[PDB]
């Protein structure tokens with residue numbers, strides 16, 4: 140395969156649309172920052188989820204706390220730690236990589252890294268807490284559709300059932316986006 | 327929330343970019359056809375996966391057979407059955423709904439319905455067959471990152487472990503896209 144020519148069609152707030160000519164096929168790509176999400180498991184197997192309105196679907200979806208990697212030069216897990224704090228007011232002593240997902244492989248370069256945070260502490264001073272098994276059932280029942288939440292929930296479930304293990308923070312993130320950040324079309 | 331005004335920024339081959347003013351915030355949306363994917367489980371718990379090049383990431387990813395809902399007026403499962411046939415040369419007697427996922431909730435209206443096909447028959451006349459547990463381990467190991475594949479693989483795994491059940495074809499698909507299809511910007 141080979142990119143013959145790239146042409147920027149639009150640069151927006153959180154993404155840019157680009158069209159390339161490949162190997163020859165037209166391939167439009169949505170350049171994204173990439174994002175991080177957190178499955179914060181407490182000492183009793185419960186994780187917090189937020190209920191956020193998504194204009195794309197015109198309704199509120201149940202999701203894991205998450206945020207865009209829109210801070211040039213900021214380490215993903217630091218981005219993640221801030222989001223966990225800002226979103227559900229929790230600080231965690233242990234951080235590991237749970238699952239990375241390529242959200243829309245067909246038209247965007249967005250990739251999302253999902254962390255597993257443990258050893259939680261309520262700091263500072265709508266959302267809900269769900270036992271992992273319950274969250275897993277909400278997924279297979281279609282009550283949780285956000286793709287990032289699906290991946291994180293089912294993954295931590297696989298971990299809690301002993302089927303799988305969390306991974307090291309330094310695990311390589313193969314498809315971490317870079318293009319849109321490279322643009323820095325701001326200021 | 328409320329959409330004040332919509333403005334089309336671009337209409338491409340498989341999607342359109344639109345920008346709306348909300349409740350007041352700018353919200354750019356990628357209108358998509360929606361797609362369907364298939365977890366085809368054989369009589370021994372193995373499922374077929376394809377290894378397809380994704381220009382967005384510049385590499386080949388392991389995925390479930392899948393296709394866009396680009397056939398105006400075609401039922402999703404029929405779309406799905408054609409793809410299973412065309413992709414891995416299999417016909418299945420039983421079709422159920424496994425999991426629906428909203429791929430990129432933050433910038434696209436794309437939603438994907440994942441079916442579970444059983445009672446397989448090799449018809450007609452690269453890909454590979456993976457025992458479900460192995461596929462599940464490839465996910466938690468980061469060897470399977472496609473979000474649709476992650477959802478389908480972990481979901482069928484939850485089903486094979488007895489934790490969850492498949493659902494009826496008539497299960498409601500809450501976020502099935504309609505906007506881009508409504509455009510019919512062709513011919």
Ligand SMILES: Nc1ncnc2c1ncn2[C@@H]1O[C@H](COP(=O)(O)OP(=O)(O)OC[C@H]2O[C@H](O)[C@H](O)[C@@H]2O)[C@@H](O)[C@H]1O
Nearest residue numbers: 152153174205206207251287352353354355430431432433
């Ligand atoms: N389509 C959009 N157009 C313009 N601005 C947008 C759009 N979508 C979100 N924004 C904005 O970016 C900011 C939201 O930032 P975050 O809270 O960091 O992230 P979030 O939108 O929740 O997304 C995290 C992740 O979840 C979603 O599933 C999304 O696909 C993404 O990977 C919002 O306040 C707003 O400025």
Ligand SMILES: Nc1ncnc2c1ncn2[C@@H]1O[C@H](COP(=O)(O)OP(=O)(O)OC[C@H]2O[C@H](O)[C@H](O)[C@@H]2O)[C@@H](O)[C@H]1O
Nearest residue numbers: 165166167168243244245246339340361392393394438474
């Ligand atoms: N970014 C693109 N720009 C222009 N055309 C594209 C693009 N991406 C794919 N196409 C095309 O659409 C056709 C592919 O159709 P399908 O085989 O029906 O579907 P597919 O691309 O595999 O996607 C199915 C699903 O998987 C992906 O994860 C993608 O996010 C989507 O939901 C290709 O032959 C080609 O015309």
